[PDB]
Structure 1
Amino acid sequence: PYSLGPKISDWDEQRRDWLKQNPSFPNFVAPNKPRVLLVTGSAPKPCENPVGDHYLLKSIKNKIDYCRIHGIEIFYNMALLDAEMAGFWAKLPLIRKLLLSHPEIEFLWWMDSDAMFTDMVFELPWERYKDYNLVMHGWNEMVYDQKNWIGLNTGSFLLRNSQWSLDLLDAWAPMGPKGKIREEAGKVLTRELKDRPAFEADDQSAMVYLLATEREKWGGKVYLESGYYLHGYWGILVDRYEEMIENHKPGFGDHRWPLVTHFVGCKPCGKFGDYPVERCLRQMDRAFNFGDNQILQMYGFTHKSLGSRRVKPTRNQTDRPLDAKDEFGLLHPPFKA
């Protein structure tokens, strides 16, 4: 029987004592700002199609820029800690190890390599989650009522460092072990969940199943967020970037300017995906430039067009660089107190 590790039951007590002992590493970097670690990664070998690595590179730069502006540290995993938890399941052993290794972390923010920040201004409403331990983009009706396999998304979520999360991780991993375990589990998920195709068990479907069947146990501390695009399905967003630039401005994080554009199904690192490769890559270029225009804007540049690698100035240079106006206050934001 697979296990993520030796059972721990007093983790909240171990954290409490550790923080008391090490006040130089508080779990809240500011009155209402918890210490956050964004976690991502990818397989340690080159992508089967070579350009896949290039889009992982653009992806990590994108996360670097957002995290530098919002004062959150990054960890990029390139190792498989548990041979039985490969693929999308590999983030469960990783998350557990980082939680136990960094008790100063209050929230762990996992983000897929195919997800990209498209709103550089938007800051997460931390106080909205002060009484919850797991935050995912989704809808209650889709998860608990319809049991729809896309009622939530596990490519961008927050997990609080607590005993509740360690147990949640244990209740989530059983369908992960590669082979017959994961295959037979997929048959269950396709049968019990709505609209789910037939394939091996994935971490997202397992979360829906767990929450739909054990709501009394977990639902109280799970926050299904649908007010902003903590996760944003690319298939309905990338085409509207021009409309967003024309009518709106960064900071909304929702349908007016999504926080995250997640390219579910594109698989730029594998050989085939669920969508045309041409559309996937061209729209990944557009999403990257959509977010990168907000970075270059601080420095007086912008991409010639949303699909061009080339940039152009947005204003003449000056011998008085400190008088310029930072439109969205990202050069010296309050997130870097």
Structure 2
Amino acid sequence: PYSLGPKISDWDEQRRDWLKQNPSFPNFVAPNKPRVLLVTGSAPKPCENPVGDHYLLKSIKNKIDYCRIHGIEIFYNMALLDAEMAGFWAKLPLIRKLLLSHPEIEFLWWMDSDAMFTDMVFELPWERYKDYNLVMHGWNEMVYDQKNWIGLNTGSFLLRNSQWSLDLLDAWAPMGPKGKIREEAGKVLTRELKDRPAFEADDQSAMVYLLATEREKWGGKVYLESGYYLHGYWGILVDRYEEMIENHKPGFGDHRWPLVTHFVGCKPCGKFGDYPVERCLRQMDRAFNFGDNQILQMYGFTHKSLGSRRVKPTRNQTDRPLDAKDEFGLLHPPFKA
């Protein structure tokens, strides 16, 4: 019987003591700003197609920029800590290890390598979640009623460092172990979830299954967010970037300017994805430039077009650089208090 590790039950107490003992590492870096660690990663071998690694590189640059602006630290995992939890299931052993290793962390923000920040201004509404322990993009009707396997997304979610989350992880992991366990579990999810195709169990479908069946246990602390694109399906967003630049501005986080553009199904690191490789990579270039344009604007540059690697100036240089207007206040945002 698979276990994520020795059962822990007094974690809230262990954390409470530690924080009291170690006031130099508070779990809140500011009145209403919890300490957040963004966690991402990739397999420890080169991508099967070679440009895959190049797009992992642009992906981590993109997260570096956002996290530098909004004052959150990054952990990039390149190791499998549990041979049975491979692939998308590898993030459960990782998350548990980081939560227990870093009690100063109040929120752990997992973000897939195929997910990219496209709104560099938007700051998560932390106070909205002060009473919750798990925040994922999704809809309650899709999860609890329709039991739709895409009722929520697990490529970009917040998990609070708490006893509730250690138990949540234990409840979530059973369908993960590679082999017969994951395969037979995939048959269950395909049968019990709406619109799910037939394939081995994935971490996302299992979360829908867990929350739909055991809602009384977990639902009270889960927040299914759909007011902004904590996760954003690329297939309906990337084509509208131009409309967004023309009618809106960064900071909305939603349909007007998505916080995250998540390239589900493109699999730039594998041999084949569920979509044309041409459209996947060109749209990943457009998404990367859509965000990078917000970085370069601070420094007086922009990409010639949304699909070009080349940049151009947006203004003449000056001998009075400190007089310049930072349009969105990202050079010295309040997130770096």
For the residues of structure 2 that align with 1:302 and 1:103, how far apart are their CA atoms? 40
**TM-score under structure 2 normalisation?**
1.00
For the residues of structure 2 that align with 1:70 and 1:249, how far apart are their CA atoms? 18
SS in 2 for 1:127: helix
Once the 2 structures are TM-superposed, how far is the Cα of residue 321 of structure 1 from its aligned partner? 0.2
Once the 2 structures are TM-superposed, how far is the Cα of residue 228 of structure 1 from its aligned partner? 0.0
For the residues of structure 2 that align with 1:319 and 1:133, how far apart are their CA atoms? 49
**TM-score under structure 1 normalisation?**
1.00
Once the 2 structures are TM-superposed, how far is the Cα of residue 18 of structure 1 from its aligned partner? 0.1
Once the 2 structures are TM-superposed, how far is the Cα of residue 253 of structure 1 from its aligned partner? 0.1
For the residues of structure 2 that align with 1:321 and 1:204, how far apart are their CA atoms? 48
Once the 2 structures are TM-superposed, how far is the Cα of residue 79 of structure 1 from its aligned partner? 0.1
Once the 2 structures are TM-superposed, how far is the Cα of residue 184 of structure 1 from its aligned partner? 0.1
* Superposed counterparts of 1:215-254, under 5 Å: 215-254=215-254
Once the 2 structures are TM-superposed, how far is the Cα of residue 131 of structure 1 from its aligned partner? 0.1
Per the alignment, residue 208 of structure 1 pairs with 208
- The C-alpha deviation readout for 1:51-93, integer Å capped at 9, x for no partner, is 0000000000000000000000000000000000000000000
For the residues of structure 2 that align with 1:5 and 1:168, how far apart are their CA atoms? 13
For the residues of structure 2 that align with 1:213 and 1:324, how far apart are their CA atoms? 56
For the residues of structure 1 that align with 2:252 and 2:49, how far apart are their CA atoms? 35
For the residues of structure 1 that align with 2:217 and 2:321, how far apart are their CA atoms? 56
Once the 2 structures are TM-superposed, how far is the Cα of residue 128 of structure 1 from its aligned partner? 0.1
SS in 2 for 1:265: coil
- The C-alpha deviation readout for 1:248-292, integer Å capped at 9, x for no partner, is 000000000000000000000000000000000000000000000
For the residues of structure 2 that align with 1:30 and 1:9, how far apart are their CA atoms? 29
- The C-alpha deviation readout for 1:210-258, integer Å capped at 9, x for no partner, is 0000000000000000000000000000000000000000000000000
For the residues of structure 2 that align with 1:57 and 1:183, how far apart are their CA atoms? 32
SS in 1 for 2:316: coil
Per the alignment, residue 162 of structure 1 pairs with 162
Once the 2 structures are TM-superposed, how far is the Cα of residue 305 of structure 1 from its aligned partner? 0.0
Gaps of 5+ in 1: none
- The C-alpha deviation readout for 1:135-192, integer Å capped at 9, x for no partner, is 0000000000000000000000000000000000000000000000000000000000
For the residues of structure 1 that align with 2:173 and 2:302, how far apart are their CA atoms? 44
Once the 2 structures are TM-superposed, how far is the Cα of residue 109 of structure 1 from its aligned partner? 0.1
SS in 2 for 1:57: helix
SS in 2 for 1:305: coil
Q: Which runs of 4+ in 1 moved over 2 A?
A: none
For the residues of structure 1 that align with 2:320 and 2:18, how far apart are their CA atoms? 49
Gaps of 5+ in 2: none
Once the 2 structures are TM-superposed, how far is the Cα of residue 307 of structure 1 from its aligned partner? 0.1
For the residues of structure 2 that align with 1:125 and 1:244, how far apart are their CA atoms? 22
SS in 2 for 1:297: helix
- The C-alpha deviation readout for 1:190-213, integer Å capped at 9, x for no partner, is 000000000000000000000000
- The C-alpha deviation readout for 1:21-48, integer Å capped at 9, x for no partner, is 0000000000000000000000000000
SS in 1 for 2:279: helix
Once the 2 structures are TM-superposed, how far is the Cα of residue 20 of structure 1 from its aligned partner? 0.0
SS in 2 for 1:76: strand
- The C-alpha deviation readout for 1:90-136, integer Å capped at 9, x for no partner, is 00000000000000000000000000000000000000000000000
For the residues of structure 1 that align with 2:156 and 2:322, how far apart are their CA atoms? 37
SS in 2 for 1:74: strand
Number of residue equivalences: 337
For the residues of structure 1 that align with 2:201 and 2:87, how far apart are their CA atoms? 11
Per the alignment, residue 307 of structure 1 pairs with 307
Per the alignment, residue 93 of structure 1 pairs with 93
Once the 2 structures are TM-superposed, how far is the Cα of residue 306 of structure 1 from its aligned partner? 0.1
For the residues of structure 1 that align with 2:164 and 2:233, how far apart are their CA atoms? 29
Q: In percent, how many aligned pairs have the same letter?
A: 100
* Superposed counterparts of 1:32-111, under 5 Å: 32-111=32-111
For the residues of structure 2 that align with 1:325 and 1:226, how far apart are their CA atoms? 33
Per the alignment, residue 321 of structure 2 pairs with 321
- The C-alpha deviation readout for 1:273-322, integer Å capped at 9, x for no partner, is 00000000000000000000000000000000000000000000000000
